[PDB]
Amino acid sequence: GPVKKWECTVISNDNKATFIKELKLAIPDGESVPFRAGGYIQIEAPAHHVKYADFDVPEKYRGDWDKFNLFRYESKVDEPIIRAYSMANYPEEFGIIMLNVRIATPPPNNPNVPPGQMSSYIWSLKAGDKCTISGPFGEFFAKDTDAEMVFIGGGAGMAPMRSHIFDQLKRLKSKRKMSYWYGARSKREMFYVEDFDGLAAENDNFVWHCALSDPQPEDNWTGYTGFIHNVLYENYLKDHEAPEDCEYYMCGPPMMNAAVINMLKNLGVEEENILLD
Ligand SMILES: Cc1cc2nc3c(=O)[nH]c(=O)nc-3n(C[C@H](O)[C@H](O)[C@H](O)COP(=O)(O)OP(=O)(O)OC[C@H]3O[C@@H](n4cnc5c(N)ncnc54)[C@H](O)[C@@H]3O)c2cc1C
Ligand SMILES: [Mg+2]
């Protein structure tokens, strides 16, 4: 029994983006999971049946759900299952586990396949529910150097990026040069804006930027647009005197990971300085 297990209580499970919920868990007796930033826990689910029509999805985020009739879906799970989720809190955010969980719907080109089992279960959870977690685990840990760090995130990849960045600035009091580049579709898909604005205001070695690939009329957006690998290249790495000497930490959807890795490699960054997972 080397691995520990906690039956947690759901504090909240609010949408932060159209397809991402922030699951916040309270550890029993106020204790903390002894994890490292970049690490993960596992959630286990009992057998269950959930309906997407019962999810709490705010009107602000419902547009695509209505557009693609995503509330049609139901998920029946006959036997227990288990999956990993990355911590979004850093280790001195005690007493809690914060996760960012993307709902894995059936793909639009394959609309009658079963919905994602664990994420549909997690999206059914409401304040007061119980959630069993085990861990902690991980190998996506920061290197112990003084090298500049470039963090690149998309989607639910926000979670380990937040954990890493907060761990550096708050627990380690790092003075390393640090930037964070987050790509999202439109302004409603952004979140943790207060957290990262807060850190950038208080730490002259940290800056961050969001790029919107499809800003909406209501966003009145005048920030960066496009895909985050082009925005990072055009606005920072193209003129960087030694990009190969930075450490790049990233977590995003597969298409973002591939485009970023290709852009970094074409700049001469070696695989040893490109960290994922
Ligand atoms: C170390 C680690 C960290 C992770 N951290 C996070 C995190 O922070 N956030 C997060 O959201 N995820 C994270 N994940 C991923 C997570 O563990 C799950 O893989 C994710 O939630 C999807 O699992 P699921 O059970 O919901 O979907 P699954 O049931 O595994 O299904 C996956 C997808 O396949 C589709 N599908 C189902 N059946 C078929 C079929 N017959 N044909 C075609 N397609 C089909 C489903 O509709 C769904 O879209 C992490 C994974 C690892 C390993
Ligand atoms: Mg949002």
Numbering used by the authors: 128 to 404
Can you list sentences taken from the study reporting this PDB entry?
In the human pathogen Vibrio cholerae, the sodium-pumping NADH:quinone oxidoreductase (Na+-NQR) generates a sodium gradient by a so far unknown mechanism. Na+-NQR is composed of three integral membrane subunits, NqrB, NqrD, and NqrE, and three hydrophilic subunits, NqrA, NqrC, and NqrF. The six subunits NqrA, B, C, D, E, and F of Na+-NQR harbor a unique set of cofactors that shuttle the electrons from NADH twice across the membrane to quinone. Here we show that ion pumping in Na+-NQR is driven by large conformational changes coupling electron transfer to ion translocation.
Subunit NqrF consists of two domains, an amino-terminal [2Fe-2S] ferredoxin-like and a carboxy-terminal FAD-binding domain, which is similar to ferredoxin-NADPH reductases (FNRs). The mode of NADH binding was further characterized by X-ray structures of the isolated FNR-like domain of NqrF, as well as of a variant of NqrF lacking the C-terminal F406, which is important for binding of NADH.
